[PDB]
From a paper:
At the inner surface of fly photoreceptor rhabdomeric membranes, the master scaffold protein INAD (encoded by inaD for inactivation no after potential D and contains 5 PDZ domains arranged in tandem) forms stoichiometric multi-molecular complexes with phospholipase Cβ (NORPA), Ca2+-permeable transient receptor potential (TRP) channel and eye-specific protein kinase C (eye-PKC). In this study, we show that the PDZ45 tandem of INAD functions as a supramodule binding to the entire C-terminal coiled-coil domain and PDZ-binding motif of NORPA (CC-PBM) with an unexpectedly high affinity. Our biochemical and structural studies demonstrate that INADL PDZ89 forms a supramodule and binds to the entire C-terminal coiled-coil domain of PLCβ4 in a manner that is strikingly similar to that of the INAD–NORPA complex. The striking similarity between the PDZ scaffold and PLCβ interactions at the molecular level might point to an evolutionarily conserved molecular adaption in PLCβ signaling in the animal kingdom.
To elucidate the molecular mechanism governing the interaction between PLCβ4 and INADL, we determined the crystal structure of the INADL PDZ89–PLCβ4 CC-PBM complex. To facilitate the complex crystal growth, we also substituted the eight Lys residues in the α2 helix of PLCβ4 CC with Ala. Furthermore, we discovered that covalently linking INADL PDZ89 with the PLCβ4 CC8KA-PBM was necessary to obtain diffraction-quality crystals of the complex. The complex structure was determined by the single-wavelength anomalous dispersion method using gold derivatives at a resolution of 2.8 Å. Strikingly, the overall architecture of the PLCβ4 CC8KA-PBM–INADL PDZ89 complex is remarkably similar to that of the NORPA–INAD complex. In the complex, PDZ89 forms an integral structural unit and extensively binds to the CC-PBM domain of PLCβ4, burying a total of ~1211 Å2 surface area. In the complex, the formation of a supramodule between PDZ8 and PDZ9 is mediated by a number of hydrophobic residues from both domains. Like that of the INAD–NORPA complex, the binding interface of the INADL PDZ89–PLCβ4 CC-PBM complex can be divided into three distinct sites: the PDZ9–PBM interaction site (site 1), the PDZ9/CC interaction site (site 2), and the PDZ8–CC binding site (site 3). In site 1, the last four amino acids (ATVV) of the PLCβ4 PBM bind to the canonical αB/βB-pocket of PDZ9. In site 3, the carboxyl group of E1164 from α4 of the PLCβ4 CC forms hydrogen bonds with the backbone of the GLGL loop of PDZ8 by mimicking the classical carboxyl group–GLGF binding found in all PDZ–target interactions.
Author numbering:
A (entry chain B): 6 to 74, 80 to 264
B (entry chain C): 271 to 363, 373 to 459
The structure:
């Protein structure tokens, strides 16, 4: 609930927004490199097919007309067709095979780039969230340092009040009626108050560190919760690298 | 550990993913016309393959009590990733129709062709966004190319259907098989 207040801060939300624009630029660059290659993949094949069709039609017309007008031309021309299609079937078999290569190398490279940016964004989010939290922890700690200094200030001035207070009412005590005991009572009062103030001073110092130790306790396990949050995010991003390796296979855009 | 897999009922099973991947492949979603999340192939390396009970046509209905009736395809794959080392699932146990497409200026049909990791057949992999197949909008990922211009491709190679589709010139008459 602390992390959520941290995760809706002005600086954090902007980094999220700048990360999402990065993500769009990558999709747009990936798509341009997609279309650049399909055009050339098709451009190449539609050349090779247009030419093969041209050669077959030329040979097909050659026997068709001569048959109307045979002998060896029938035998020779059909050898040229078997020669020519058998070669075409193996020009494309080679091309179609290398067009799978070009695509699959790209899609996996593209898929890798996208994985790495998603990982880099995750290291950038943990580092920001944490640095913000440490900065909050620093202005939390030394604000408390502040109270501790004023807490001592009030005590010293409070202790001065009692001591001066316990010296007027001792003068006004009528029951004394003697200087020798009065000299002693003042010595007795001064020593008792001096002891009391030093003990309350010692108890404040002890109390003050105790409460700062509690600040350390709260701060530590906020940072521990953020570190577990980043660990869980890394662990699941590994399971998409894992599922991606199984899904990987060759592919041919058509 | 309570029950084995039996058809007809909304079964509830649990798989131990452990250190290996779950290894499922999905089709469908709210974004698609299928309107169901359906297992399409079980990757042999995965955990459900170890488990042995999920076959290749099983309809997933919820993961960790997350109802997938509105989940898009992308939403459903993350639902598979967010599983802990243990997995909680609820499962249940072709549609053939024709699609004709005209090839665009430069690219072509604008779809990708692959084969199942283990099993024959040849299926649609990825649909290029501005593609000729995209603007028709009836094909989705996982659709089987049964025939192309009449010729049956059911037990054809990936090189076969790639070669036929790439070299085809005009309108391409496809038969498509989809899960249910
Ligand atoms: Au072309
Ligand atoms: Au960090
Ligand atoms: Au005063
Ligand atoms: Au985090
Ligand atoms: Au051909």
């Amino acid at each position: 609930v602390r992390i959520e207040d941290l995760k809706q801060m002005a600086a954090y939300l902007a980094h999220l927004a700048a990360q999402q624009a990065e993500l769009n630029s990558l999709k747009a660059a990936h798509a341009a490199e997609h279309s650049t290659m399909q055009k050339l993949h098709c451009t190449q094949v539609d050349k090779i097919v247009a030419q093969y069709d041209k050669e077959k039609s030329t040979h097909e017309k050659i026997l068709e007309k001569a048959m109307k007008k045979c002998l060896e031309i029938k035998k020779e021309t059909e050898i040229k067709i078997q020669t020519l299609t058998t070669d075409h079937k193996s020009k494309v078999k080679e091309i179609v095979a290398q067009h799978t290569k070009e695509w699959s190398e790209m899609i996996n490279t593209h898929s890798a780039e996208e994985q790495e940016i998603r990982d880099l964004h995750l290291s950038q989010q943990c580092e920001l969230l944490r640095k913000l939290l440490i900065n909050a922890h620093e202005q939390q700690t030394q604000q408390l340092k502040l109270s501790h200094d004023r807490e001592s200030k009030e005590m010293r001035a409070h202790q001065a009040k009692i001591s001066m207070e316990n010296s007027k009412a001792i003068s006004q005590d009528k029951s004394i009626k003697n200087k020798a005991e009065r000299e002693r009572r003042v010595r007795e009062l001064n020593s008792s108050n001096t002891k009391k103030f030093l003990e309350e001073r010692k108890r404040l110092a002890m109390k003050q560190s105790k409460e700062m130790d509690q600040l350390k306790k709260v701060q530590l396990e906020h940072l521990e919760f953020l570190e577990k949050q980043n660990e869980q995010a890394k662990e699941m991003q590994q399971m998409v690298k894992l599922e991606a390796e199984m899904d990987r296979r060759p592919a041919t855009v058509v | 550990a309570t029950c084995p897999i039996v058809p007809g009922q909304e079964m509830i099973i649990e798989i131990s993913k452990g250190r290996s991947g779950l290894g499922l492949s999905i089709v469908g979603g709210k974004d698609t016309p299928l309107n169901a999340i359906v297992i399409h192939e079980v990757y042999e390396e995965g955990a459900a393959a170890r488990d042995g009970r999920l076959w290749a046509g099983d309809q997933i209905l919820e993961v960790n009590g997350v109802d997938l009736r509105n989940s898009s395809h992308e939403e459903a794959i993350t639902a598979l990733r967010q599983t802990p080392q243990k997995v909680r699932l609820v499962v249940y146990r072709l549609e053939i129709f024709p699609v004709d497409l005209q090839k665009k200026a430069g690219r072509g049909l604008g779809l990708s062709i692959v084969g199942k990791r283990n099993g024959s057949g040849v299926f649609i992999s990825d649909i290029v966004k501005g593609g000729a197949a995209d603007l028709d909008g009836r094909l989705i990922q996982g659709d089987q190319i049964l025939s192309v211009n009449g010729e049956d491709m059911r037990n054809a190679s990936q090189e076969t259907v790639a070669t036929i589709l790439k070299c085809a010139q005009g309108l391409v008459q496809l038969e498509i098989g989809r899960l249910r």
